């Protein structure tokens, strides 16, 4: 009950958060999710659940006076004697404001800061998602412009190839008014390729701008994501101390 590694009514999910990315040997004892205790040991990237079972305590032919005796024994001796293969190296200690009023006022403060920060983060995500969608749209339209420009250029190439002999013919025939018709159309064509090329160029600018805007949105999110996590842990730490400081069931 006074042991640092003993936590009480903490869930398997609470233990998981405590053991998340911990070194091999990291352990803590809690009450069984239902044999009244459960030891959790960090081994090979995983959390190993070992049941503590009489007048005696043990895992296996029980032979221990208390839970502290069973733990402290394996805290100095490798678990290899039971099965292999690591010692209970690092305990998760239940040890790291004066009044309920001071704690309560700090809780209200952190809970306000947290609700502010979580609403901001969510709005940054929607801004991020929309910028991501728009960048995708612009890249697709540039590809469509590339294909459109190719067609209008094939039309110039085709117009040139077909009119060459016809304009040679009309030059001889003194039909300058017909030459002026072929040229006026070809100019209408070239102006249009100029308009499309410019439109693609302007979109290429917009994309470079919005790509830089996405980069900054991602930067902003990467800075507030860690603060949001710690503020939530603090907020949750204060709720815990408030429950404990207050009258219990």
């Amino acid at each position: 009950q006074d042991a640092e590694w003993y936590w009480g009514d903490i869930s398997r999910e609470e233990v998981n958060e405590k053991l998340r990315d911990t070194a091999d040997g990291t352990f803590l004892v809690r009450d069984a999710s239902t044999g009244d205790y459960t030891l959790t040991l960090r081994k090979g990237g995983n959390n190993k659940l070992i049941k503590i079972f009489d007048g005696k305590y043990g895992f296996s032919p029980l032979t221990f006076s208390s839970v502290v005796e069973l733990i402290n024994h394996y805290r100095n001796e490798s678990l290899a004697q039971y099965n292999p293969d690591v010692k209970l190296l690092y305990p998760v200690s239940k040890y790291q404001e004066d009044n309920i009023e001071a704690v309560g006022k700090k809780l209200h403060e952190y809970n306000t800061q947290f609700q502010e920060k979580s609403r901001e983060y969510d709005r940054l995500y929607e801004e991020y998602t929309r910028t991501s969608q728009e960048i995708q749209m612009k890249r697709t339209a540039i590809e469509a412009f590339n294909e459109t420009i190719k067609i209008f250029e094939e039309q110039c190439q085709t117009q040139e190839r077909y009119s060459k002999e016809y304009i040679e013919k009309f030059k001889r025939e003194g039909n300058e008014k017909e030459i002026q018709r072929i040229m006026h159309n070809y100019d209408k064509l070239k102006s249009r390729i100029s308009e499309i090329i410019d439109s693609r160029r302007r979109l290429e600018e917009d994309l470079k701008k919005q790509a830089a805007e996405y980069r900054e949105i991602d930067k902003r999110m990467n800075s507030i994501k860690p603060d949001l996590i710690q503020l939530r842990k603090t907020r949750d730490q204060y709720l815990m101390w408030l429950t404990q400081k207050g009258v219990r069931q």
Binding site: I50, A144, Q155, R232
Partner: protein, 1009 residues
């Protein structure tokens, strides 16, 4: 690539009534033609070739009919417009231009490929491009499944062809529950058989009293015997000769084509429970067989085109070099250093400890570091993956440092050809999912991000003088105290704790486990997957493992069982034991678990695709579940390739699906206008716009005469334009209705009311409504008539969906519009006055109990007067299932299971029929017993619900990211307690939330009354 929007042009939702189109003549000339937006290409081409004579070089132009039009579409594709009956507004043009060309190449292939491209939401030519050998291999090898399914479909033609299009909608068992059988008159049903009599198409009744277990042919025999007699040598001759008719449901496309007891057909089964008259239609087999066009499959063009060391011989540990990352988006001021976190995973379980690179500055992401793993190369399991991320580290708050992932990426250690990775590799990393705080994402997909303007990690794998291949499967193959403990472990839920002692016990008794096949998932997690010798032994056991129930096989398909032998075993249990009924029921989950597959080509994808191509009801929802996710770049290649092969082989259903796809596109576009350019407009002005737009022939052609994506058995005929409106809610939902064109529409559904919503994600609602359906099915099977209402809901795209409207219903807040607490009961009394009052209070009580238990178990969004609806006949239901499970844990650190549906005085007054002291009545006691049985019936089937939620973990649903999110139903179902303690707990939550009224009534000691 896919279209940005559903607009008529790029950056323009609607074309103006008249538009100038640049026409590029084959003589190199350009004619700007003014066209009507709705004009067909036939019209535009005729008007162009008339005009072209007023332009130079006109003599060089062939006959107007020697050419077609080509243009660039919004998908950036060059599309040849062979179907000149299409309107200009429907071409999905990028810019208003058309190029005149002579048609070349294979017309039929190009047309089909365009039809597939339209349906799957991307041009099929984008696949021919893909350099990945795995991709090209999937496209060729999947065709074997296509040919196989088409052959099985065209085998017993026309009966096998009719069974494909109109599969029997039947329950999994002919067994009728006690309360269902008692609803029958001595095991007999009163059926109405209708006939459409020529030449006036006059409707003639025939009431028949027959055994519930009568086969459809037997029902036709009673009708053939009643339509002639009310002799004997003649009747026998007449009945035997006249077995050339079929039964159909009046008002919808549901047929009774297979020899199943009439009562096993869901429609008939539904009629008995509801106490409704079954209305069937008798039509000749010839009338139906001749309405079935030929579904021919063609092998595509891409199908007709042009020193290894074993892993076990590699005596070394695993090491991977992290070289560098191109960039990372982090501001140097806020973050101290960056590093690469890596792990070797088998499913979600690491095979050894995670290893990091050294910390480096934000500006210089270079590591040039070999990471050594505590795993021997021959000990790598077949499903071994490298899960990595680039993380930021910021201290500054004492000795407390904050670690955050920046981008993640996963890779299979073996490719689809069983080759171990080697040499250099570039991996484009993915954005961290919103809500994910874990530094690695092992549940995330494998492969590089297709978007290359993203952080790119450089890696290097070892070279072993040759190509290392995973060893062959032949090479791999080289008490009562204990019986009671095993049975107890096997009855435990999929997520229950397994102690190290229990793992060791299960491994030690592995050969005896075969005697209890259902313990297999528990035994598979007990295996040390980092030991080739343990795995080899598990392989020999799984090969000869006895079959398990399909609901247990589905567990071996989630993210916890990545092994191909385990997964192959699972797919085979589904192949032999999964009813088409349950496959349709679990399709949402079965589609989702395709994201967990290591490779494109696998047994699951082959099983689902063969089923989609042999049953059109499965094919319909299989297509829509894959299509709705085509925006999601993590699965769009996999799903696009799967959709291509489905569309390529589904036959005529492609024509129908494309009509649905185009109806939906017009609705997406119409709502985008209302939400964007017209957002500040009034309801009257928006309504005037909708009325004008919906009257246009282009709109009218697309939105009339197609099948409902909610239920393809329902035909959507002509629109009822006077009943179509923009709803008052924030994202502009459209309330639509269509005539039912069925000759007998009067009998089933004269109305086809659907809400179209563009703006919110409907996936969670769709999952909740599926669960409510499965829960209600559990209750009915157990004799509990708790009537639920899982109304139609289908996600059809990215935050785009359909909701089936429930007719003759009102919200509590609508009913309340007088000020009272008796208002609800008074409203129900006035709707059900007389003899029918008792039936309404029963129905209200039963529906109330079901919703009370369902919403509590699921932890649904808070109930209120706008969220709760009541039908005219008393039936209560809930709407808006946008939230579930532990949605308030992160927001408010509070730990208490909410009671979303608190039965206030209003609902109590109804249940107790107006009586003062509502909790003290015999009607309230009866209602409590309903809740109790309903609660325990779901707890008894907890494995199913846990598995269904476990199968959805990679879906991208915000409130379903980890197994920790599923832990909520473990709490509400009190799965770590005894059944008796769990009922006590439910009673306690009901009591706490209602402030008294629910305590014991049995004895607390033994629970006997």
């Amino acid at each position: 690539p896919p279209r940005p929007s559903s607009g008529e042009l790029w950056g323009i939702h609607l074309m103006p009534p008249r538009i100038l189109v640049e026409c590029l003549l084959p003589n190199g000339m350009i004619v700007t033609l003014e066209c009507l937006r709705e004009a067909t290409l036939i019209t535009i081409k005729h008007e162009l070739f008339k005009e072209a004579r007023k332009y130079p070089l006109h003599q060089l132009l062939q006959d107007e009919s020697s050419y077609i039009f080509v243009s660039v579409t919004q998908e950036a594709e060059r599309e040849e417009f062979f179907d000149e009956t299409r309107r200009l507004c429907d071409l999905r043009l990028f810019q208003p231009f058309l190029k005149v060309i002579e048609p070349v190449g294979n017309r039929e292939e190009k047309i089909l490929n365009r039809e597939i491209g339209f349906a799957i939401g991307m041009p099929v030519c984008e696949f021919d491009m893909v350099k990945d050998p795995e991709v090209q291999d999937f496209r060729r090898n999947i065709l074997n499944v296509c040919k196989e399914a088409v052959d099985l479909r065209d085998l017993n033609s026309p009966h096998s062809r009719a069974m494909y299009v109109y599969p029997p909608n039947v329950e999994s068992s002919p067994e009728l529950p006690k309360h269902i059988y008692n609803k029958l008159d001595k095991g007999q049903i009163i059926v109405v058989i209708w006939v459409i009599v020529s030449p006036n198409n006059d409707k003639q009744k025939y009431t028949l009293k027959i055994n519930h277990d009568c086969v459809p042919e037997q029902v036709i025999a009673e009708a053939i015997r009643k339509k002639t007699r009310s002799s004997e040598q003649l009747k026998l001759c007449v009945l035997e000769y006249q077995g050339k008719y079929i039964l159909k449901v009046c008002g919808c496309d549901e047929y009774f084509l297979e020899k199943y007891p009439l009562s096993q057909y869901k429609y008939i089964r539904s009629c008995i429970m509801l106490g409704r008259m079954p209305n069937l239609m008798l039509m000749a087999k010839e009338s139906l067989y001749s309405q079935l066009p030929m579904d021919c499959f063609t092998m595509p063009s891409y199908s007709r085109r042009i020193s290894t060391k074993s892993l076990w011989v590699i005596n070394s540990a695993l090491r991977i070099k992290i070289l560098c990352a191109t960039y990372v988006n982090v501001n140097i001021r806020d973050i101290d250093k960056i590093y690469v976190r890596t792990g070797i995973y088998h499913g979600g379980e690491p095979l050894c400890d995670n290893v990091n690179t050294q910390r480096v500055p934000c500006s210089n992401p270079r590591w040039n570091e070999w990471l050594n793993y505590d795993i021997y190369i021959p000990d790598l399991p077949r499903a071994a993956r490298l899960c990595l991320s680039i993380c930021s580290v910021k201290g500054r708050k004492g000795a407390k440092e904050e670690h955050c992932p920046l981008a993640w990426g996963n890779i299979n250690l073996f490719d689809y050809t069983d080759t171990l990775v080697s040499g250099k590799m570039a991996l484009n990393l993915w954005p961290v999912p919103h809500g994910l705080e874990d530094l690695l994402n092992p549940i995330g997909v494998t492969g590089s991000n297709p978007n290359k303007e993203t952080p790119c990690l450089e890696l290097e794998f070892d070279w072993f003088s040759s190509v290392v291949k995973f060893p062959d499967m032949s090479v791999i193959e080289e008490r009562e105290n204990d019986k009671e403990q095993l049975k107890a472990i096997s009855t435990r839920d999929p997520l229950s704790e397994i102690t190290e002692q229990e793992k060791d016990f299960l491994w030690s008794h592995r050969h005896y486990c075969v005697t209890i096949p259902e313990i297999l998932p528990k035994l598979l997690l007990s295996v040390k997957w980092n030991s080739r010798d343990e795995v080899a032994q598990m392989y020999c056991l799984v090969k000869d493992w006895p079959p398990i129930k399909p609901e247990q096989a589905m567990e071996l398909l989630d993210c916890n069982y990545p092994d191909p032998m385990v997964r192959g075993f699972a797919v085979r249990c589904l192949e032999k034991y999964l009813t088409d009924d349950k496959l349709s029921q679990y399709l949402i989950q079965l589609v989702q678990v395709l994201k967990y597959e290591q490779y494109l080509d696998n047994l699951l994808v082959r099983f689902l695709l063969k089923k989609a191509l042999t049953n059109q009801r499965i094919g319909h929802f299989f297509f829509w579940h894959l299509k709705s996710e085509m925006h999601n770049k993590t699965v769009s290649q996999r799903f696009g390739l799967l959709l291509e092969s489905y569309c390529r082989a589904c036959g005529m259903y492609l024509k129908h699906l494309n009509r649905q796809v185009e109806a939906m596109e017009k609705l997406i576009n119409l709502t985008d206008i209302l939400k964007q350019e017209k957002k500040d407009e009034t309801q009257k002005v928006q309504m005037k716009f909708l009325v004008e737009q919906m009257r246009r022939p282009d709109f009218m052609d697309a939105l009339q005469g197609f099948l409902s994506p909610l239920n393809p058995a329902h035909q959507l005929g002509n629109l009822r334009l006077e009943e179509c409106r923009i709803m008052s809610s924030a994202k502009r939902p459209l309330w639509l209705n269509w005539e039912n064109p069925d000759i007998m529409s009067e009998l089933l559904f004269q109305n086809n009311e659907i809400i179209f919503k563009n703006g919110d994600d409907l996936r969670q609602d769709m999952l909740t409504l599926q669960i409510i359906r499965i829960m209600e099915n559990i209750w009915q099977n157990q004799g509990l008539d708790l009537r639920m209402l899982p109304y139609g809901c289908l996600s059809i795209g990215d935050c785009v969906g359909l909701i089936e409207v429930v007719r003759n219903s009102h919200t509590i807040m609508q009913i309340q519009c007088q000020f009272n607490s008796h208002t609800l009961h008074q409203w129900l009394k006035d709707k059900n006055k007389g003899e029918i009052y008792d039936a309404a209070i029963d129905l209200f009580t039963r529906s109330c109990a079901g919703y009370c238990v369902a919403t509590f178990i699921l932890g649904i969004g808070d109930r209120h007067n706008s969220n709760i609806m009541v039908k005219d006949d008393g039936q209560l239901f809930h709407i808006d299932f946008g939230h579930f499970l532990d949605h308030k844990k992160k927001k408010f650190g509070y730990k208490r299971e909410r009671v979303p549906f608190v039965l206030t005085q209003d609902f109590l007054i109804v249940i107790s029929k107006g009586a003062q002291e509502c909790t003290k009545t015999r009607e309230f006691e009866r209602f409590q017993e309903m809740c109790y049985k309903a609660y325990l019936a779901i707890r008894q089937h907890a494995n199913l619900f846990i598995n269904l939620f476990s199968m959805m973990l990679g879906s991208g649903m915000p409130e379903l990211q980890s197994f920790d999110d599923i832990a909520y139903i473990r709490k509400t179902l009190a799965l770590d307690k005894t059944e008796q303690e769990a009922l006590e707990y439910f009673m306690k939550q009901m009591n706490d939330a209602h402030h008294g009224g629910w305590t014991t009534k049995m004895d607390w000691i033994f629970h006997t009354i």
